[PDB]
Amino acid sequence: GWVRPDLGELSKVTKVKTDRPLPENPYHSRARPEPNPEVEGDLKPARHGSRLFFWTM
């Protein structure tokens, strides 16, 4: 009683019911480095300008 599968069927992506848990860290990655802190706050002007030796702005 076995029907041979049609052209297209055996290459389908199927779904599988499992009773094993999902591997939570299959790559065994350690803790990620903490990122550099972003910038936050409004942009105040430069305190007394460029401060390049004598240029007051």
Partner 1 sequence: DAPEKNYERTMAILQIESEKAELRLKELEVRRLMRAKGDGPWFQYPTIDKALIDHSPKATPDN
Among 39, 43, 45, 57, binds partner 1 (CB under 8 A): 39
Measured between alpha carbons, how far is 24 from 32 in angstroms, rounded to an integer?
15
55 belongs to the binding site for ligand CDL (CB under 6 A): yes
Using an 8 Å Cβ cutoff, are 49 and 56 in contact? yes
Q: Residues 5 to 34: which contact partner 1 by CB under 8 A?
A: none
48 belongs to the binding site for partner 1 (CB under 8 A): yes
Measured between alpha carbons, how far is 5 from 14 in angstroms, rounded to an integer?
14
Among 14, 25, 36, 56, binds ligand CDL (CB under 6 A): 56
